[PDB]
Amino acid sequence: MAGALRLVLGDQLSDNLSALVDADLSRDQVLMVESRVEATAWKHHKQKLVLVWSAMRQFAERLRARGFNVRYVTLEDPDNTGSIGGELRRALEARAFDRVIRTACGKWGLESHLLSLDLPVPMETREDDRFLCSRAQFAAWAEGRRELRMEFFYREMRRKTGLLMDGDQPAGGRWNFDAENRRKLPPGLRPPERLRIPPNPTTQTVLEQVSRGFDDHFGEVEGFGWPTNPDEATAILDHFIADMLPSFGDWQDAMSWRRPFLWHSLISPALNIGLLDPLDICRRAEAAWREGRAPLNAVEGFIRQIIGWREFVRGIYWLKMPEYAQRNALDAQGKLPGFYWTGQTDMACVADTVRAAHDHAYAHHIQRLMVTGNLAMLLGVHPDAVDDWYMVVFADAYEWVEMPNTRGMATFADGGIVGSKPYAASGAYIDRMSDYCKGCRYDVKKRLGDDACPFNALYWDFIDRHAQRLAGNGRMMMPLRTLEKMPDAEREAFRKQARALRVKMGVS
């Protein structure tokens, strides 16, 4: 009866974590490690380092107030070995323990390493039931399905969770109210001001430490406004539910120059480390519709992102890894252009996305998908280099969610497991969906020449390069038909242009 050592990782900062259930406060110890292995696995955005480390330090103080004995190993500790496994060994030598208890993490490499660790005591690994769909439940649903479509999974999750269900029927008589013909913001509509969280004393200390010790990481730390504890995260969620949720379904795909937040919730960095709960978030949104404070299409569109896409991408990650991390369906071998890190590009849309990534460690979905993600696909950047960028620059970036959205939906490197079809688009899409192109130095109505918008020739070269494969796909009928009606001289023209753009941008 010596007690159990309970490991808590940087994205596991929840009281209801399975590793903390049924703890014996008089015998057990909680281990939390500020790990430089994890801090340099990718060179995370400086704001992500501030977010995680400030939140772990406050989460540890919260556990101590509840009677937990917490062994907190800071990054200034001269005896910190730097790794989770090394610090688990050091904690087991410090005193007697009967076993180690932990919760399955969200990175396959770390999870595989921990499962293979040879410790002096047994190590029990519990499932992370903070998610709404267990790993086993997704595998059971995916069994026998020749393709995994989010819509059928989303319907199952609506029945399991009972969210937006009247009896056995979905609210409103249909599952999905996704209204097509989405458009850019009207010229007079100014996006509202958003709530930011001024750093608390703990966050200020971590901020100064990150400014001084990790200066060679991407991004600015100044202006850090992310929530770092449940109260600050609830304040962000309260602000979204009351002030932005009613407009969620209107501008979900719009882009406005230097308005990086629009009406999005901005909860992913706090949700992904456990500061908010997925079921509680969705129930609050449903209650807004049930009590007449938000329309159904807005609330359903919001809940679909969380119980649908978020659970879907996690399901595919753990279902297909580790082979998923190595898939390269389009044989993309190019380098990532330097303006992804510096933002020094004449493409206004790309420059604004990198600017938001640098200044706020955030960019909303359609920019990650249709701007920087689409461009990396069209350019043929190696999927390893695209994964590294999305892991580094966004404060919500963890491999279980970053990779299926990046290697899958954004760049089709998984052959269509996640997205079922590549989301390629020319500058015409960005033009219809944003206010970028009129202020851009390029001309979105041109495909050849120095003034031509690079997305235009790169898009048609992409469809031309993968024409035979995309014909078997099926969902690319209209672009292939237009390409087939194009004379040979026009085909060779945008080909030459696309090769030149790949050289100009340092890709290949």
Ligand SMILES: Cc1cc2nc3c(=O)[nH]c(=O)nc-3n(C[C@H](O)[C@H](O)[C@H](O)COP(=O)(O)OP(=O)(O)OC[C@H]3O[C@@H](n4cnc5c(N)ncnc54)[C@H](O)[C@@H]3O)c2cc1C
């Ligand atoms: C290339 C690419 C990379 C991405 N990388 C990440 C990542 O590292 N981490 C991450 O959390 N999300 C990632 N996403 C999903 C999505 O871009 C973000 O969840 C969202 O932009 C975060 O902003 P928000 O909280 O305001 O989202 P909202 O627009 O307010 O959406 C509400 C919530 O829905 C969830 N959600 C929405 N779309 C997705 C999605 N596609 N996958 C999973 N959850 C989703 C998030 O929890 C989000 O907080 C990525 C998407 C793409 C296309």
Ligand SMILES: Cc1nc2c(=O)[nH]c(=O)nc-2n(C[C@H](O)[C@H](O)[C@H](O)CO)c1C
């Ligand atoms: C920056 C960072 N730092 C730490 C840390 O110091 N200690 C820790 O235990 N975890 C950290 N993490 C999170 C992990 O690297 C990893 O992404 C998640 O735990 C996956 O579940 C991250 C992302």
Ligand code: SF4
């Ligand atoms: S013209 Fe092309 S590069 Fe410029 S903002 Fe529009 S889509 Fe982006």
